[PDB]
Amino acid sequence: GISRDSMHKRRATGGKKKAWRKKRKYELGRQPANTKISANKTVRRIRVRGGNVKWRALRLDTGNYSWGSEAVTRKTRILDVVYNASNNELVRTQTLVKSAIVQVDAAPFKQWYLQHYGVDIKKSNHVLRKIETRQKDRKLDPHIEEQFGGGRLLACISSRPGQCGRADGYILEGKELEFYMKKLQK
Amino acid sequence: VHVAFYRNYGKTFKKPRRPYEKERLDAELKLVGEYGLRCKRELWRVQYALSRIRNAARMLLTLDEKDPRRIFEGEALLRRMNRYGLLDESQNKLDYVLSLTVENFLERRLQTLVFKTGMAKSIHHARVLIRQRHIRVGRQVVNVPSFMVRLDSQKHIDFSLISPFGGGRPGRVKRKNQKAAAK
Amino acid sequence: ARGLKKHLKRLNAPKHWMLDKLGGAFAPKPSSGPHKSRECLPLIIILRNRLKYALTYREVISILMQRQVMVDSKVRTDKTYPAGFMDVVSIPKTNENFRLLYDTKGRFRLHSVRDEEAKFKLCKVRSVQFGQKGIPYLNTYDGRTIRYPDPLIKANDTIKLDLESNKIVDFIKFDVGNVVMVTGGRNRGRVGVIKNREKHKGSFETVHIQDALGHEFATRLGNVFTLGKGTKPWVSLPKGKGIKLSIIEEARKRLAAQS
RNA sequence: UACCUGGUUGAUCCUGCCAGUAGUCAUAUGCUUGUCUCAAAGAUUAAGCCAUGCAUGUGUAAGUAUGAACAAAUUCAGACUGUGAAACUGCGAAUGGCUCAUUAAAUCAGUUAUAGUUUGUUUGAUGGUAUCUACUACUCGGAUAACCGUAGUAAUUCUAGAGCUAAUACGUGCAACAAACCCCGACUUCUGGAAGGGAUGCAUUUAUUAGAUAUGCGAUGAUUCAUGAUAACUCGACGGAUCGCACGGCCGCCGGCGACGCAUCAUUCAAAUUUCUGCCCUAUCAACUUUCGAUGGUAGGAUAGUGGCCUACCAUGGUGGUGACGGGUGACGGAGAAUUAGGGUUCGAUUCCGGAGAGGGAGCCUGAGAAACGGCUACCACAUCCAAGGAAGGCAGCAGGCGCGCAAAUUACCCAAUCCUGACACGGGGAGGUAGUGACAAUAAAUAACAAUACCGGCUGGUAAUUGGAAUGAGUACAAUCUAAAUCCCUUAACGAGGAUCCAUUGGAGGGCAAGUCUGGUGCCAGCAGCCGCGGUAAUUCCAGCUCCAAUAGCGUAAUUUAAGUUGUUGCAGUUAAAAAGCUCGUAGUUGGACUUUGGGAUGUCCCGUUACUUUGAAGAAAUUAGAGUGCUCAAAGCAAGCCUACGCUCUGUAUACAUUAGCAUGGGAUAACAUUAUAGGAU
RNA sequence: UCCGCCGGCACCUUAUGAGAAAUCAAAGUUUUUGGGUUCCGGGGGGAGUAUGGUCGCAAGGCUGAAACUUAAAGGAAUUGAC
RNA sequence: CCCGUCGCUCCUACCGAUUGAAUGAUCCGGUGAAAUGUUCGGAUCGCGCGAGAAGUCCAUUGAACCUUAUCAUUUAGAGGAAGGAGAAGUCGUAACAAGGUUUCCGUAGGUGAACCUGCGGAAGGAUCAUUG
RNA sequence: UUUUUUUUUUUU
RNA sequence: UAUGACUCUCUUAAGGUAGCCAAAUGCCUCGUCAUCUAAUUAGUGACGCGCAUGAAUGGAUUAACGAGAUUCCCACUGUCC
Ligand SMILES: [K+]
Ligand SMILES: [K+]
Ligand SMILES: [K+]
Ligand SMILES: [K+]
Ligand SMILES: [K+]
Ligand SMILES: [K+]
Ligand SMILES: [K+]
Ligand SMILES: [K+]
Ligand SMILES: [K+]
Ligand SMILES: [K+]
Ligand SMILES: [K+]
Ligand SMILES: [K+]
Ligand SMILES: [K+]
Ligand SMILES: [K+]
Ligand SMILES: [K+]
Ligand SMILES: [K+]
Ligand SMILES: [K+]
Ligand SMILES: [K+]
Ligand SMILES: [K+]
Ligand SMILES: [K+]
Ligand SMILES: [K+]
Ligand SMILES: [K+]
Ligand SMILES: [K+]
Ligand SMILES: [Mg+2]
Ligand SMILES: [Mg+2]
Ligand SMILES: [Mg+2]
Ligand SMILES: [Mg+2]
Ligand SMILES: [Mg+2]
Ligand SMILES: [Mg+2]
Ligand SMILES: [Mg+2]
Ligand SMILES: [Mg+2]
Ligand SMILES: [Mg+2]
Ligand SMILES: [Mg+2]
Ligand SMILES: [Mg+2]
Ligand SMILES: [Mg+2]
Ligand SMILES: [Mg+2]
Ligand SMILES: [Mg+2]
Ligand SMILES: [Mg+2]
Ligand SMILES: [Mg+2]
Ligand SMILES: [Mg+2]
Ligand SMILES: [Mg+2]
Ligand SMILES: [Mg+2]
Ligand SMILES: [Mg+2]
Ligand SMILES: [Mg+2]
Ligand SMILES: [Mg+2]
Ligand SMILES: [Mg+2]
Ligand SMILES: [Mg+2]
Ligand SMILES: [Mg+2]
Ligand SMILES: [Mg+2]
Ligand SMILES: [Mg+2]
Ligand SMILES: [Mg+2]
Ligand SMILES: [Mg+2]
Ligand SMILES: [Mg+2]
Ligand SMILES: [Mg+2]
Ligand SMILES: [Mg+2]
Ligand SMILES: [Mg+2]
Ligand SMILES: [Mg+2]
Ligand SMILES: [Mg+2]
Ligand SMILES: [Mg+2]
């Protein structure tokens, strides 16, 4: 099968290497997951060296995404893939790979913002006092505000769907968000 | 793997470099006849042993006197020679080892000692006795003429207790003759 | 090979076991345990070759299966159980207690010990680190793991372990002026007092040890075992007190005994 | 352990080789072969092909018994508690054994790293939130083997239905009960605290945060490392519905010693990859690698993990006369073997270590571990059976057979020793051992000894198929001993020697080189002769007889070392013996002048940039080699063993040395190598 | 014409040197073996041949084997014979 | 003492039509079993769901075969032409003396054969010598 | 300075 | 054995040298051998007392060229079955 050995390669001098042994099971490789976005979630179980377990995501719909500035992690939906540095065809195919740029639903983060800061982007006296105290340091990125206006947030996938079976990530912020917005505005 | 393969063995003699030296042949024949040896192989084996000992002594003498290796090995070699009677007490230096001849080793053979102490009328008679089991060193019967007798064991040489010359139970020839004469 | 090897050739067996060249085609392969294969003395060797209680492999197995041999106060029924340095081997039926200690020639010796000296042992600490939940612990070179150790204890130190309670009762810090015993290399089995330590960044540390007779020898840090605080070992040493005698004086002593 | 001799000439001195002499744990062959102890043995040509048999199975009190299996008990009651075949379940079969085909910085040796990963098992520690409104936990559910009965097929541990019944098999499920932390939070005497709710075991994934150290806070040379906290996430093979012994204290509740099982860390047994240096011949191989990965970068996929290992984009890099690339090897590498002044030369298939393979490739399941082949799948080459429809293959495992060749053994016995393995003190082991064949090789060692008589030479010696009695093992055999059982050895009743027929052989007799100008035959014939030469009718040389010489149970004959200072670095030659390019230039390479701190006073001590190299230390498998000790009867060997018979002792011994280059650490600063100097942009 | 120095083509004598000698004042300072450096020989033939490569218009040049065969070939010098 | 052509026997290699042949490894393109992943598919089995065989789609590893070419090791071949060895072959006399034309090197041409001749060169010459 | 070719194998 | 390096001779001055060949040149002849084919009076290579080859009545070779004569192979096809 797929092999990770260096026997088939050329020497650094450019010379050819002559085979002296067959392929070994301990240097094998396996086919890519090619995870995609679909409502029909599908994760396969792989038995790997030592009896350990790997998860191959063939199709994923939701992911655990983190807002770093507010330090809030929520499970949201992955809407689509917008940018992929490695290969452009992956954006067309909606492939889910690590470091890919995707759009995620902003509903959970909007709900958390409303519940925490009491702002939309009965109540008891202690609750309004807490919200007022939190309001002093309420600073929000205007770009993130515009993104919330549309209900979708740009995020980077920081996990490996083909290894862990989960498309988790973090919402773009600051200079990284500006860089990716500039690259996408074309 | 065969465990027997790990047992080691070695040669004990070498052939002469020049097969047909007349003087060498004469000297070897003289020694062989004097000491009742069956062939030149025994003399060559004794020469090989003497050469090994002399080479060891020479190698030790090359070293510095205060060398611990020289001291240890020279003491061991001198003790071995004193035990086997090659060197006397006065000969307490490694230099006297180099002055050892094949005759010195041949004189320590059980055959030569048996002939010398008077248990045999001749060297050949002694050889026949030892190979016929009429001689014992201590309480052990020895039938190897090449047996090297140590100084301590030299005085214990005696006729075998189960032999006609050392005890009773005469030989089969004597018993047959007695039976024949009984009639 | 496609996996772990289960056989050990007699020639490949470690030299300090002192196995006959023609004894057989195999030697007892040490089992997994507290001590490494090359630095252990199997119970089969102890019972058959050394103590001669068992005349064969089968007799060794029969003796061990009766639960008559205890290692570190625990009954062991494994013939190839690796018993190494500082280990205590106790046979209650014969009322016999031994400690495994390297002799001046670098070979394991079953040094007879008293009932009071058989209730503890010495271990060398490898490292101290935090486990799960932040619980501190240290591991010794004999495969032991102790939780909540004394904060002063650190790597390369020695700990006195009471076996009955399985607890640390004292410890010796690795420092100059402590009597130590060499557990590896050509100087294995020698006993002396540390003179100095040379530390090289990203390289093995060197330790200089002076023998009771003034002889000096250097070794690596991993080959040094501390036996006590100052110059008095915490345990009784075997015959010779870890003093290596030159071949010349050994021969002199042998001749004197002969005469 | 520093060695030469014959051969060119009428004769001489040389160069130079041929021949001889000795060695091989070196193969084969010829002849001969009485005893004891050791011991290689289808590698060389064919990693060529294989009939037949065996080489991997496995049971403890402690997973599962209703055999319609045996045995003892029960006269009345009994779920079972004695053996247990069979079968399910679990484990193992990835070890061992065989071989050297492929492979030339590759394997491999020494020396590094994983802060770049996996690791059944053993050893030491560590396991706290599941149902939350269903609601068995005094214990959940559905099958299946063995068993039985309907069979199909020529046929296979080929195969379909039907009837039962178990689990430490499968699938579920309460999972003894808490505290603490965080978030939301009605309500509220409101900078507060507050009911209630959510989250909260361990594991995975992603983020935030702490993890200091010129009144608490771990480790390394070095890590946002170990570890803690928070927010969430996962449709989590985790968090015991298991088994054996016993039988007890409170008032049904508690209670011991174990077996097996799941999860985390550490440890052990290991693997994988990896740093530096190191390999034979060849230039009649000088450029090679880069479409289609070559060198590197960015981002991903895959992997147990690093890495062009692979994908997309980007850049043009990477190696090379300090020999790349290509080719040859009758090339697996090393530990080592042969020979030894020193330096060296040759060999290394083979029992130890590492690698690779199971007719040639490729793919893969199971499993902790395999790209496994006494596992499977496909192609290719061979190839067995068939009822012609199908079905089964892998001896470079132990024997054995064909073939091949100069060239290599029994289709035996056993787990008694060493050790391995399984559920396991017990089974199994063609691993391993015993025995058979065995002049590979090695050790010891018979074939005669002594007197009388007769001859000889000076009481002293030699000869005699003359005489005389003594001794003994080769053989033979009770017996014992040995042995897993046998056999052999050792011991030993009764036999066993005069031409002691119990009969020693292999090569030679001109020189090298020890030994006949003997006798007969042949007559440049036949033949001998390693070389020089013998034989032409008086042959020390051929064919024979006698005699003699060398070795001796061995000797002769047909790659490699020495001799060889005839491969020369130590250490050869080049005028005429073979030899210096017709001449000059010249890059790589090699080499390269002198010069920089000496001395006294005293007493190791006080006074006026990078390397080579050398000293010392650590570490550097065994076996082999050297070597200490030791009466296996001696010896090659072996690691034994010794006193005295003490119901024991010697803590019995089972040392020590050697080990190129390369790597690490340390003292020295002579001799050398590279870099630098002054446009001061210099030091302070 | 005479006396000197440096460089050069050579010559004569001599051995305390070397060499198998012939001879050599460099063919010396070499078993008392080592100043630096290039080329090149390994008994005599086959053979400077075959093959490959390369240069040349050609003639041929450069590089350059093996199979096989053989006990001598060869150098200096001595005596005789011619 | 000695050279070569020519004559006979034997041995070893060399050249060679045959767009020669065989084997092994790489190169170009093509076909391509089996397995794995993916899509579809749903015989059938349990409680509208869960599991799921045959089969099918596209990809990955990729045996095996065909085409092209290059290396490496072997090997057949009508015939041609070299070298060597072998007691008493033929024709001359080329080399050894000034060998009877001194010998030899390079080059070119020509003769049965050794060899002859032309140009330049060497003494290894048969001259170390004419201040005559 | 006209011309002058040849001498079977081994051995002494 | 065969031939004839060598010597001498006749017609008629010489006596086919270097080369080449069953040739667009050979009767015998569809010559002999090898190769190509299942099979070849064809083709190619080789041999040569060659009826009757041969040197500017020019001999031998030759890249490139040819609506020139010949043989074979691949592709192609109603030439043919
Ligand atoms: K062998
Ligand atoms: K089973
Ligand atoms: K297994
Ligand atoms: K290595
Ligand atoms: K700290
Ligand atoms: K190597
Ligand atoms: K990787
Ligand atoms: K990369
Ligand atoms: K290899
Ligand atoms: K397993
Ligand atoms: K076999
Ligand atoms: K056994
Ligand atoms: K001779
Ligand atoms: K006659
Ligand atoms: K005669
Ligand atoms: K002779
Ligand atoms: K001439
Ligand atoms: K001449
Ligand atoms: K002529
Ligand atoms: K003759
Ligand atoms: K005419
Ligand atoms: K012309
Ligand atoms: K035309
Ligand atoms: Mg193995
Ligand atoms: Mg020598
Ligand atoms: Mg002569
Ligand atoms: Mg081979
Ligand atoms: Mg390397
Ligand atoms: Mg583990
Ligand atoms: Mg961390
Ligand atoms: Mg990467
Ligand atoms: Mg090979
Ligand atoms: Mg080998
Ligand atoms: Mg073998
Ligand atoms: Mg091996
Ligand atoms: Mg394999
Ligand atoms: Mg085979
Ligand atoms: Mg196969
Ligand atoms: Mg396989
Ligand atoms: Mg196998
Ligand atoms: Mg097999
Ligand atoms: Mg043989
Ligand atoms: Mg022998
Ligand atoms: Mg006899
Ligand atoms: Mg003689
Ligand atoms: Mg005669
Ligand atoms: Mg004769
Ligand atoms: Mg020479
Ligand atoms: Mg000459
Ligand atoms: Mg010459
Ligand atoms: Mg010249
Ligand atoms: Mg040149
Ligand atoms: Mg030559
Ligand atoms: Mg002439
Ligand atoms: Mg002339
Ligand atoms: Mg003339
Ligand atoms: Mg004539
Ligand atoms: Mg003609
Ligand atoms: Mg023409």
PDB file of N, CA, C and O in Angstrom, chain C residues 13-34:
ATOM      1  N   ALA C  13      24.780 -14.432  27.089  1.00  0.00           N
ATOM      2  CA  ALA C  13      24.456 -14.113  28.469  1.00  0.00           C
ATOM      3  C   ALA C  13      25.571 -13.273  29.092  1.00  0.00           C
ATOM      4  O   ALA C  13      26.741 -13.407  28.723  1.00  0.00           O
ATOM      5  N   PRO C  14      25.237 -12.396  30.041  1.00  0.00           N
ATOM      6  CA  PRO C  14      26.266 -11.531  30.631  1.00  0.00           C
ATOM      7  C   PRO C  14      27.352 -12.343  31.322  1.00  0.00           C
ATOM      8  O   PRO C  14      27.098 -13.415  31.876  1.00  0.00           O
ATOM      9  N   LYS C  15      28.576 -11.815  31.284  1.00  0.00           N
ATOM     10  CA  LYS C  15      29.724 -12.562  31.786  1.00  0.00           C
ATOM     11  C   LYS C  15      29.673 -12.749  33.296  1.00  0.00           C
ATOM     12  O   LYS C  15      30.116 -13.786  33.802  1.00  0.00           O
ATOM     13  N   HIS C  16      29.142 -11.772  34.034  1.00  0.00           N
ATOM     14  CA  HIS C  16      29.150 -11.867  35.489  1.00  0.00           C
ATOM     15  C   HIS C  16      28.250 -12.979  36.011  1.00  0.00           C
ATOM     16  O   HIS C  16      28.331 -13.305  37.199  1.00  0.00           O
ATOM     17  N   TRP C  17      27.399 -13.565  35.164  1.00  0.00           N
ATOM     18  CA  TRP C  17      26.639 -14.735  35.587  1.00  0.00           C
ATOM     19  C   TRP C  17      27.535 -15.955  35.738  1.00  0.00           C
ATOM     20  O   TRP C  17      27.219 -16.860  36.519  1.00  0.00           O
ATOM     21  N   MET C  18      28.645 -16.003  35.003  1.00  0.00           N
ATOM     22  CA  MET C  18      29.607 -17.098  35.109  1.00  0.00           C
ATOM     23  C   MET C  18      28.956 -18.431  34.732  1.00  0.00           C
ATOM     24  O   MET C  18      28.911 -19.382  35.514  1.00  0.00           O
ATOM     25  N   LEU C  19      28.455 -18.480  33.502  1.00  0.00           N
ATOM     26  CA  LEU C  19      27.831 -19.672  32.952  1.00  0.00           C
ATOM     27  C   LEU C  19      28.842 -20.449  32.121  1.00  0.00           C
ATOM     28  O   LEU C  19      29.697 -19.863  31.451  1.00  0.00           O
ATOM     29  N   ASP C  20      28.738 -21.775  32.171  1.00  0.00           N
ATOM     30  CA  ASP C  20      29.687 -22.626  31.469  1.00  0.00           C
ATOM     31  C   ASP C  20      29.523 -22.477  29.963  1.00  0.00           C
ATOM     32  O   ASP C  20      28.411 -22.335  29.452  1.00  0.00           O
ATOM     33  N   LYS C  21      30.649 -22.511  29.245  1.00  0.00           N
ATOM     34  CA  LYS C  21      30.593 -22.408  27.791  1.00  0.00           C
ATOM     35  C   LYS C  21      29.861 -23.598  27.183  1.00  0.00           C
ATOM     36  O   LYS C  21      29.073 -23.434  26.245  1.00  0.00           O
ATOM     37  N   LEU C  22      30.108 -24.799  27.701  1.00  0.00           N
ATOM     38  CA  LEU C  22      29.501 -26.019  27.189  1.00  0.00           C
ATOM     39  C   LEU C  22      28.301 -26.470  28.012  1.00  0.00           C
ATOM     40  O   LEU C  22      27.806 -27.582  27.808  1.00  0.00           O
ATOM     41  N   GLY C  23      27.825 -25.635  28.937  1.00  0.00           N
ATOM     42  CA  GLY C  23      26.671 -26.014  29.735  1.00  0.00           C
ATOM     43  C   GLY C  23      25.427 -26.248  28.904  1.00  0.00           C
ATOM     44  O   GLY C  23      24.619 -27.125  29.219  1.00  0.00           O
ATOM     45  N   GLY C  24      25.251 -25.474  27.840  1.00  0.00           N
ATOM     46  CA  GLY C  24      24.096 -25.638  26.978  1.00  0.00           C
ATOM     47  C   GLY C  24      24.109 -24.593  25.886  1.00  0.00           C
ATOM     48  O   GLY C  24      25.036 -23.785  25.774  1.00  0.00           O
ATOM     49  N   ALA C  25      23.058 -24.625  25.070  1.00  0.00           N
ATOM     50  CA  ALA C  25      22.902 -23.674  23.980  1.00  0.00           C
ATOM     51  C   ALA C  25      22.108 -22.437  24.375  1.00  0.00           C
ATOM     52  O   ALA C  25      21.981 -21.516  23.561  1.00  0.00           O
ATOM     53  N   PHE C  26      21.577 -22.387  25.596  1.00  0.00           N
ATOM     54  CA  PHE C  26      20.741 -21.279  26.029  1.00  0.00           C
ATOM     55  C   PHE C  26      21.054 -20.941  27.478  1.00  0.00           C
ATOM     56  O   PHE C  26      21.586 -21.760  28.232  1.00  0.00           O
ATOM     57  N   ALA C  27      20.715 -19.718  27.857  1.00  0.00           N
ATOM     58  CA  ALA C  27      20.803 -19.239  29.225  1.00  0.00           C
ATOM     59  C   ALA C  27      19.462 -18.643  29.618  1.00  0.00           C
ATOM     60  O   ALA C  27      18.697 -18.198  28.757  1.00  0.00           O
ATOM     61  N   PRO C  28      19.142 -18.622  30.912  1.00  0.00           N
ATOM     62  CA  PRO C  28      17.844 -18.077  31.333  1.00  0.00           C
ATOM     63  C   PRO C  28      17.721 -16.608  30.959  1.00  0.00           C
ATOM     64  O   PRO C  28      18.451 -15.756  31.470  1.00  0.00           O
ATOM     65  N   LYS C  29      16.790 -16.316  30.061  1.00  0.00           N
ATOM     66  CA  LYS C  29      16.551 -14.939  29.655  1.00  0.00           C
ATOM     67  C   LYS C  29      15.812 -14.206  30.768  1.00  0.00           C
ATOM     68  O   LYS C  29      14.719 -14.637  31.154  1.00  0.00           O
ATOM     69  N   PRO C  30      16.356 -13.117  31.310  1.00  0.00           N
ATOM     70  CA  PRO C  30      15.652 -12.416  32.388  1.00  0.00           C
ATOM     71  C   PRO C  30      14.278 -11.944  31.939  1.00  0.00           C
ATOM     72  O   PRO C  30      14.097 -11.478  30.813  1.00  0.00           O
ATOM     73  N   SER C  31      13.308 -12.070  32.836  1.00  0.00           N
ATOM     74  CA  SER C  31      11.970 -11.571  32.573  1.00  0.00           C
ATOM     75  C   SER C  31      11.913 -10.068  32.834  1.00  0.00           C
ATOM     76  O   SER C  31      12.792  -9.485  33.472  1.00  0.00           O
ATOM     77  N   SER C  32      10.862  -9.436  32.322  1.00  0.00           N
ATOM     78  CA  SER C  32      10.644  -8.028  32.616  1.00  0.00           C
ATOM     79  C   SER C  32      10.459  -7.845  34.116  1.00  0.00           C
ATOM     80  O   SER C  32       9.863  -8.688  34.793  1.00  0.00           O
ATOM     81  N   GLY C  33      10.985  -6.744  34.642  1.00  0.00           N
ATOM     82  CA  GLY C  33      10.934  -6.500  36.063  1.00  0.00           C
ATOM     83  C   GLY C  33      11.611  -5.209  36.469  1.00  0.00           C
ATOM     84  O   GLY C  33      11.922  -4.351  35.636  1.00  0.00           O
ATOM     85  N   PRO C  34      11.846  -5.045  37.773  1.00  0.00           N
ATOM     86  CA  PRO C  34      12.433  -3.784  38.255  1.00  0.00           C
ATOM     87  C   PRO C  34      13.805  -3.484  37.678  1.00  0.00           C
ATOM     88  O   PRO C  34      14.131  -2.308  37.470  1.00  0.00           O
TER      89      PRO C  34
END
